[PDB]
Each structure stands twice: as C-alpha cells, then as structure tokens.
C-alpha cells in the first residue's frame, strides 16, 4: 500500500530548529522524489521544497532558501525537512507528496499522493486557559421572536477548545464559530444559540467551554438583562 | 447619479407569463450585481432576485425561485425578469437596484423607479 | 474522303495512345532492373494497360466498321463491346484504386488493381447479352436503364467517390513525394471528368428524352492523356523515356529549442539557463505529442533528460556543466530529429 | 517562473449543474497541468493529470481540458460530494512547481437575510478590563455578508475581527459573528453601540444598538 | 428515305431511335436518313 506518514510537527518558538520527518510505504524514496508543500490556515497551497534521494540535488523555495534543509534516508526509505529561523509566518500545514522520475506515466501524474497534514505552529505565546464571558441578549436584542444566547471564550492557547449548552442538550440553532488569532497571540472564540424569546423562555442557560491543553472547563450562565 | 428605467405591463390573469425590464443609464452593469424586489401594498419591500456579473450565475427568493427567471443583456445595459405562473399574490410594485459592491455584499445604492404588477 | 478523313484520325488516336502507353510500360520494365517494385508503378502500370484495352476495343472496332460499312465478324460482335466496356470501366476505376493508394501512403504503411480489373470485367459481362445481330443491337425500355448503370458505375459514382477520396486524402494530407503524387493523380482525375462528361451527359439526355464520333474522339483523348501526365510526374519513367500541421507544429517547436540552446550557450548565469532550459522542456514535450511514435517520443525522452541534467546542474550553479549537458541536446537533435524532418520529404 | 491564475474564486451551483472552472498559466508551457479536490481538514487530492487525462479512481464526471494555455476542469453533473476547493498547477520541473488560488465549489440556494443581534460585554469581562462588543449574523444562505462597526455614530476599523462559519449541513445557510474590541476605560468613553448589517437579501441596512 | 436500310452507329452507344416502324439502337454516328427520335414521327413518316 502506498502512503506518506508525516509527523514531527507541533509547537516551537519563533526560532525554529524543527525537524519533520515523512515516511514512505509501497513507493520507495528511491523511486520517486519526494516534495514539501506548506498550506497556511485559510490560505491556499505552496510548493516549499523537493529532494531526489538517489540521483540528485534538493531545491527550495525563493520563501525558504538559507533556512530549511531537505534530506533523506535510504535505508529507513524516509525524508526530512529542517527548518531553522522559524517565523510565525512559516506555522501551516505541511504535506510531503511523491512526483515520478521522467520518463513515462510516473513523471505525469504529479502529486498522485499527498499522505496527511502535519501541522506547524510558531508562536511565543504560552500555554493559558480561556476565560468566559456570556453575552446575555438586552431586552431590545430581537426580543419578542426568537433571540440568540451569546457566549465568548477569550485568550487561550493553543486553539483545541470545545464549546457546547447545556452539557450539549441544546443543539437547536448552534454555531460556534472558528477561532480567531489576536495580536496577543492568543486565540478568541465566539458561540450562539437561537431560543424562544419572553426572557429566552425564562430558562438560564449554561455555556461550557473547555480547553484541553490547560485543562481548562468553565460553565457560565446566560440570563436575560 | 446613476438612473434606472424600468418597465412591466399592467393587469394580467394567472397564468403563463409577464416581463419585465429595466435598464441602467450613466453606469455599465457587466461589473456590478443587479437585483429585483417586489412591495406589496401594505408591505415593505422583498427581495426577488440578483443576478451577478460573469459566472456567479442567478439567485431567487423563496416566493419567485423556480417560477421567475433573471437575465442581463450587457450591450443594452438591461436586466429581465421573466415571472412565470403568476398568482394574484404576487400584485406589487417592482424595483431595480444595483449593487456598487463587486464583492456582492449587496450595498444597493440606486434604485430608481418601480412600475406596477397586477394579477387579477 | 470525309470517310477517309475520319478513319485517319481514327488511325492517329490508336497510335497516340497505344504508343504512349507502350512506350510508359516499356520505361517501367526497364526501371525493373532495379528491383523497383514501387507501389505507384503497378498502378501507373495496369492503367496504361487498362488505355491500351481501350485503345485496341475501341478505336480498332470503330476503324473497322468506318472501314466497309459495318464491324464485320456474332459472338466476337458482343465481345467487343464487353471489352469496350471493360476499357470504360477501367479508365476510372484505376484512377480510383491510384487515389485509395495515395491515401494509404498518408496511412498505415497488387490487391486493389486486380480489385479494380475485376469491377471492370464483371460490370462489363451485361454486354455478352446486351449486344448481338448485319451488326449488333443494344435491343432492350432499356435506354435510361443500361444508360444510367453506366453512366454511374462508369463516371458519375467513380467521380464523385474518389472526390471523396480526395478529399480525405487532403484530411490526411492537412491534418512531399506523396502530395506529389496526389497531384498527378488529380490531374489524371480532371482531365478523365472533362473528357467524359459530355459522353454520360448526352446519353442519358437520349435515355430520359429522345455527331457522338466528336465525343467518342475527346473520350479516347483522355487515354493518350493520362501516360504524358504520369511521366511528367514521374522522374524514374521520364528519365527512361530519353501530417502538415503537425509537422508544422513539430519546426515550430524545434525552432524553439533551438533558439533555447542560442541562449544557453551565450548564457552568463544560473538563471538564464534554468529560464532557457525551462521553455526547451514546453517546447519538447509539445514536439513529443506531435506526430511526424516509438522512436520519436524516445528520442523526445533523451532531450527531456537531458535538459533536465542541465537543469540540475544550473540549479547547484553548475552554469558551464549545464551548458555542456545542452550542448549534448545538439547531438541527440542531430540523431534523431533529422530523421523525423525527412518525413517532410514524404508528406 | 510559471504563475496559474484562476478567476473564478467562488462557484455557486446546485445539485446536478455542470460547472466549470478555469486556469490560465503565464508562460507558454506544455499539456503539465494539474486539478486536485481539497476538503477542509484533508490533504489535496489529484483529479486530472495531462491536463486533460483522468486520475484513476476519480469518477468519469470529472474533465478536463486544455487549449494552450488555458486549462479547463469540468463537472458533467454536480454531486453533494464535490463542494469542495479545487486546485489547478503546473507542473514543468520539480523546481518550478506553482498552484493557483484555489476555487471553491457551494451549493446554490435561495436567498434569506439572516438575523441580526448585538451583545454587548459582559460585566465579568469589563472587570478583566476588556469590552467585546458581538454582532451576530443567524443564517444567511449566501456568505457575502458586511457588518459594519458604530460607535456613537463613528466608524469602527483595525478594532474589529469577523468569523463565518461553514455551510449548514442541513440548512446550507452561513453565520457571521463580529467582535469589536475596547479597553475597559474605550468601553467607558462610549455610550451607544451599533452593528449595521447590509447583504444582497436586504433592501435597507439593518441596524442593531445598545447602551452601555 | 424509309427504305434506306439501318447500321447502329460505330460509336459505341445508346441512343433511342426508331426505324421502318420498330425502335432500336443509335450508336449516334455514321447513320442514314431511315433514324427517328419518336416512334410516332416514324410511324407518321413511314407506315
């Protein structure tokens, strides 16, 4: 079976010294030469680097050139890619595809595999739980018909938090909504649902979020003001 | 600055068809959205259709989609709604409005005058 | 002496076209010398011969009955028109198994002459019943029905299928020994349409509604006619006798490459090289899909390789390795792109 | 060396509708074309090779197309499957490999202005000493949306960020949230806070306020 | 003229014609007054 298994990815500072590594199955790094694509987040796809393990040179990006280094190994039929001046600019996902050597239908079918992202986040920030802030509707914010709850989850690091109501009984109308990067580093998060109005159905309504790396869960209520 | 003609029938039954038309002047529309809204007497106005520049194709409300057609002729300037199956709840006043957002964010600065649609 | 007058002309137009004909055979059996066996000699061959039958089947009869008053001789009475007839249909349908060979030249890489005397003699055999006694009678209507099969198998139908063929041979031809040859083939084919038409033209007039010598005579033209064109095509027989498209697409794209190597070899850096070595891949791979395909796509392979060493080379900043790794494209080019410019000489 | 360029960023169309996209690349280069599909979450896969030549196990409705330098892929019969991004690149050397800016496939529906609400901070977060101020677009089928930030009648920019989220998986409608940022002693130098909303569904902006 | 006998014409063809009256032949050439275009104009010159 053919695949690529990328790995080595994670955290680091803004000064780089990362080292991911891409290995192979089915397709022998020997066979075909092995490329670096990046994709930041929101952002589209861009060749990065390319190396011929047995019978040639490795070539980078003008993006990359004097930082990131591409080898391989033969023998553990496995590539690197080292990237040392890390930016925050550099944190994306990073894939590591197969191209065939010319001649024949090898060379034509450009990519054919992809294997997985492996993410890549550069950042000074520190690890920190989010603190919540419900958004309870005024008594003019669509009152009358069917208003939404509001909830925020403010300054936290890394971005795996899980947002829910109600301990996740109330899936009516819910959009919670992709994080966001601040200028602080640290990532926001907003999430809604919509209720009945005449006091959101007099009920109180509970926003629990919770953030993973910090161990973080905080349940916060929503009344009417 | 920029004026809008517009031009339906008048009284029809339920039934087949009616067209309507409209057209810019002062400003081309192969680069801007145009859109079509209906008032009935008592009501504020809907929105019935937009049709956009190159590709983006067409979209309708709930009230029109399937029944009505949008279509823009670039060399005249001119938008078409082609209403099918009319219903007499569908007696409105018709509007053109043209969105100076390329992005189609819908900023509908001009509308210029509406012409009367009655279904008997 | 107006009798005398026509058997003299008579008599001139058999030597004209058995002469003629003769003497193209006669330069096509010496060029056997040779080995050469050509494909167009066997059919330049059997439509002389085929003018030679028309020659001794329909001049001589005519130059024996202007002779006395009749073609004197039953059963030789109707063969004669059979073979008359075989003569008529061959004058067209050499002609048409020339125009299917001339396609096939143009195609993938004898059987359709002996195809073509085998129409003509059997489309002929009617004439063993048609024809017979004092001199022999076409009785049985039967105007507009043997009138018409003839005029379509003979002229109308042969013309218009090997316009068709023609057509398709500048399909071929479109999509230059061979387009050579076409041309005298169609040469051939005009001046068989111009000296026939008014024979099926007035025949089927008398067919459908109620001086022919004058036509019988331009007809028998077209015999001495053909032999002349065919040895002004032909250098081999007058000597005895004293794809474009893509082929366009191919010099553009050599042209290309050429210009490329210019600017490899003048190049002063890495970036020229990689630039010029860039536009010589396009250019070689859009060469390589055009057809002139084992050989070539595989000579294709080795410039596409070793521009791609030039590239690797210019790409560590090996500019002089890069450009010695061009200049071995100049070698391969002369290997094996020569070759494929030769087909020019084909088309 | 070489750029792909692709005008049509965003294609909306139903289930069922042929649709095409377009790429043009800047040099004149060979038939070394490339369309690959990409879910969110999920690494690209290839489509078309050859610029015209179908992956293996890529379903027949996919085509493509090449007339110099422009490339063409094709969908025959849209599938819920293929709301996707697609990718065109070119291909001529390991070292000149570049993409294009990718364009995404949604599904094509009516037109519904979304609910609009405002939020303003609440009383736990201004003790923090920030003041996020939350503008709430509830299902609009296009995603074209703008929000506009007011503060006692000025315009709000640079302490503004927006979030959409994907399309509803069951509604195919999009959600807006807007969060205006202030310090604690910003919240308290205003009174009244407002969010206009304009979309292509709206025949006048819509406007939510607040006081402090 | 009708009793001036028939010989079709050595031109090898096939023209109608009609003889005293009976149809035949014409090979178009070298032929004698005793040749009609119409079995009737023969029939009305002849019999």
């Not at chain 3, 024979?199 to 006619?225: E, K």
């Not at chain 4, 939020?119 to 977060?125: A, H």
């Not at chain 4, 989220?165 to 940022?181: A, P, R, V």
């Amino acid at each position: 079976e053919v695949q690529l298994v990328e790995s080595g990815g994670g955290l680091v500072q803004p000064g780089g010294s990362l080292r991911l590594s891409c290995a192979a199955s089915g397709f022998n790094v020997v066979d075909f030469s092995l490329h670096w694509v990046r994709q930041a987040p929101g952002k589209g796809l861009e060749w990065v680097a390319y190396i011929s393990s047995s019978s040639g040179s490795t070539s980078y990006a003008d993006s990359v050139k004097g930082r990131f280094t591409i080898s391989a190994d033969t023998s553990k039929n496995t590539a690197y890619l080292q990237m040392n001046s890390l930016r925050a600019e550099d944190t994306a996902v990073y894939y590591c595809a197969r191209w065939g050597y010319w001649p024949g239908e090898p060379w034509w079918k450009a990519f054919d595999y992809w294997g997985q992202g492996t993410l890549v986040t550069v950042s000074s920030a520190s690890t920190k739980g989010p603190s919540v802030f419900p958004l309870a509707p005024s008594s003019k914010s669509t009152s009358g018909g069917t208003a939404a709850l509001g909830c925020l989850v403010k300054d936290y690091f890394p971005e795996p938090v899980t947002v829910s109501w109600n301990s996740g009984a109330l899936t009516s109308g819910v959009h919670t909504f992709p994080a966001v990067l601040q200028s602080s580093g640290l990532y926001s998060l907003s999430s809604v649902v919509t209720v009945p109005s005449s006091s959101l159905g007099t009920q109180t309504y509970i926003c629990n979020v919770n953030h993973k790396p910090s161990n973080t869960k905080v349940d916060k209520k929503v009344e009417p003001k | 600055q920029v004026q809008l003609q517009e031009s339906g029938g008048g009284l029809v039954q339920p039934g087949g068809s009616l067209r309507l038309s409209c057209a810019a002047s002062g400003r081309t529309i192969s680069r801007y959205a145009m859109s079509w809204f209906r008032q009935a007497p008592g009501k504020e106005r809907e929105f019935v259709a937009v049709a956009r520049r190159s590709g983006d194709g067409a979209f309708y409300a709930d009230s029109v989609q399937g029944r009505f057609t949008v279509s823009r002729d670039d060399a005249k300037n001119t938008v078409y709604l082609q209403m099918n199956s009319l219903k007499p709840e569908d007696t409105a006043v018709y509007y053109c409005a043209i969105d100076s957002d390329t992005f189609y964010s819908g900023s509908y600065d001009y509308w210029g005058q509406g012409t009367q649609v009655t279904v008997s | 002496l107006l009798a005398r007058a026509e058997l003299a002309l008579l008599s001139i137009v058999f030597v004209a076209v058995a002469l003629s004909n003769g003497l193209v055979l006669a330069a096509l059996a010496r060029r056997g010398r040779r080995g050469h066996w050509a494909p167009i000699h066997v059919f330049i061959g059997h439509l002389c011969l085929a003018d030679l039958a028309v020659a001794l089947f329909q001049v001589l009869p005519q130059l024996a009955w202007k002779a006395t008053d009749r073609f004197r001789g039953d059963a030789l009475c109707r063969a004669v028109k059979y073979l008359q007839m075989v003569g008529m249909y061959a004058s067209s349908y050499m002609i048409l198994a020339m125009t299917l060979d001339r396609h096939r030249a143009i195609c993938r890489p004898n059987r359709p002459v002996l195809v073509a005397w085998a129409f003509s003699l059997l489309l002929s055999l009617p004439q063993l019943f048609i024809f017979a006694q004092t001199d022999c009678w076409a009785c049985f209507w039967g105007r507009r029905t043997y009138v018409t099969w003839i005029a379509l198998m003979v002229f109308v139908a042969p013309t218009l299928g090997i316009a068709a063929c023609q057509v398709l041979i500048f399909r071929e031809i479109h999509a230059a020994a061979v387009a050579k040859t076409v041309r005298m083939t169609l040469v051939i084919v005009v001046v068989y349409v111009l000296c026939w038409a008014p024979f099926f033209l007035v025949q089927l007039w008398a067919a459908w509604d109620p001086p022919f010598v004058l036509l019988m005579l331009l007809a028998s033209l077209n015999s001495c006619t053909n032999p002349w064109i065919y040895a002004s095509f032909s250098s081999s027989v007058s000597s005895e006798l004293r794809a474009r498209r893509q082929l366009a697409d191919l010099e553009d794209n050599w042209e290309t490459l050429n210009d490329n190597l210019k600017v490899i070899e003048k190049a002063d850096n890495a970036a020229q090289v990689k630039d010029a070595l860039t536009k010589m891949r396009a250019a070689a791979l859009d060469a390589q899909k055009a057809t002139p395909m084992k050989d070539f796509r595989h000579g294709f392979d080795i410039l596409v390789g070793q521009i791609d060493d030039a590239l690797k080379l210019a790409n560590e900043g090996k500019v002089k390795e890069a450009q010695a790794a061009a200049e071995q494209l100049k070698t391969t080019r002369n290997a094996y792109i020569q070759k494929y410019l030769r087909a020019r000489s084909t088309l | 060396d070489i750029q792909m360029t692709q005008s049509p960023s965003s294609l909306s169309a139903s289930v069922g509708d042929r649709v095409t996209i377009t790429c043009r690349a800047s040099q004149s280069v060979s038939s070394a074309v490339a369309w690959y599909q990409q879910k969110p979450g999920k690494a690209p896969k290839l489509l078309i090779y050859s610029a015209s030549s179908l992956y293996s196990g890529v379903p027949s409705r996919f085509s493509g197309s090449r007339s110099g330098t422009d490339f063409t892929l094709t969908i025959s019969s849209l599938q819920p499957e293929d709301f996707a991004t697609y990718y065109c690149q070119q291909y001529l050397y390991y070292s000149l490999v570049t993409f294009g800016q990718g364009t995404k496939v949604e599904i094509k529906r009516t037109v519904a202005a979304p609910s609009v609400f405002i939020f303003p901070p609440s009383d736990e977060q201004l003790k923090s000493g920030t003041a996020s101020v939350v503008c709430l677009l509830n299902n609009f089928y296009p995603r074209e949306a703008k929000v506009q930030w007011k503060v006692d009648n000025a315009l709000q920019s640079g302490n503004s960020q927006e979030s959409v989220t994907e399309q509803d998986s069951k509604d195919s409608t999009y959600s807006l949230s807007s969060t205006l940022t202030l310090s604690k002693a910003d919240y308290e130098k205003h009174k009244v806070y407002a969010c206009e909303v304009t979309h292509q569904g709206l025949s006048s902006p819509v406007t939510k306020s607040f006081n402090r | 003229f009708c009793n001036l006998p028939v010989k079709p014409g050595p031109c090898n063809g096939f023209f109608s014609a009609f003889y005293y009256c009976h149809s035949f032949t014409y090979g178009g050439c070298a032929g004698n007054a005793n040749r009609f275009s119409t079995i009737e104009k023969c029939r009305r010159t002849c019999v």
